[PDB]
Design a protein around this ligand. Structure first.
Ligand code: 6O5
Lengths: 173, 173
């Protein structure tokens, strides 16, 4: 059961635009069945980088791309959940990491991040809707304004309003 | 939980920067170390790796891994090193000579052949004669810095070798 290993985006699927890209679909019972086949890469003529579970049609859609891939777009739908394989979500930062989309959710001193959608412990104005494109989802370390410190978060410790996270540069020699 | 880590048998790490934090505890199994590291509970830092001492049954949790500056990889028969995948660079620089991630699937979705195995394909890419290149398990690797990036011998007898589909670090925003 490998589903908990993916980054989940609720109410989202992906569409191709460029009809050149390949997909694979199958009717199943549950979303974990999609996860298992993606993780194992069993019976897919490509590298599985993401999948969608359609809760209304009971279908897996397996993709050789993710939401960051050229020539693919997100589409809204209540019936869809998107699961992106973390092996294909860049886990290091470029520059100040304005574009960081990874799932690290703990600060440098080991404090669990507060969710962006929460005002507890800390009241703030970094609402997800105010920062579209910046993926202020769950409690992930982010740098929505591109400040010099790198990705950071409001902290779950009431005594520490915010702290930077410890995410490595992709390349610094 | 332990499967969100890359395992290196008979290996531990030693810090040469005395300021770097460490935490240890007597435990029962390596699984219990993985748990605490993943949940990051009671650790005053970001857990990036841990070692399990099988002789003393002790966890050693680290805010660093084998790619961090200020730490050394050392042989020890009683140690196993477990590195958190969120902190092993999952994109390619240049031709991917330094790629150490755990992707083991080719571009066309074929499971890689283990480097130590000679079935179905016979080869001279022996681990011992390629020290430093991390030719362990069936991971996509680029030991000679060849054009297409990391690749592997394939588990399909009709495809000797194929590149994998590991993105360049420059591919995305
Ligand atoms: O404390 C706040 O609401 C500002 C958030 C922040 C922390 C670091 C840079 O900006």
């Amino acid at each position: 059961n490998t589903i908990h290993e993916f980054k989940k985006s609720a109410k989202t699927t992906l569409i191709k635009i460029d009809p050149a890209l390949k997909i694979k679909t199958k009717k199943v019972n549950t979303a974990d069945q999609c996860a298992n086949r993606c993780t194992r890469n069993k019976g897919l003529p490509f590298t599985c980088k993401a999948f969608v579970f359609d809760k209304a049609r009971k279908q897996c859609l397996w993709f050789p791309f993710n939401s960051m891939s050229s020539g693919v777009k997100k589409e809204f739908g209540h019936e869809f959940d998107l699961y992106e394989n973390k092996d294909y979500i860049r886990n290091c930062i470029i520059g100040k990491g304005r574009s960081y989309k990874g799932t690290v959710s703990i600060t440098k001193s080991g404090i669990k991040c507060q969710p962006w959608s929460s005002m507890i412990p800390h009241e703030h104005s970094f609402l997800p809707s105010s920062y579209r494109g910046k993926d202020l989802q769950e409690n992930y370390c982010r740098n929505p304004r591109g400040e010099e410190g790198g990705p950071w978060c409001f902290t779950s410790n009431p005594e520490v309003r915010y702290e930077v996270c410890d995410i490595p540069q992709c390349s610094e020699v």
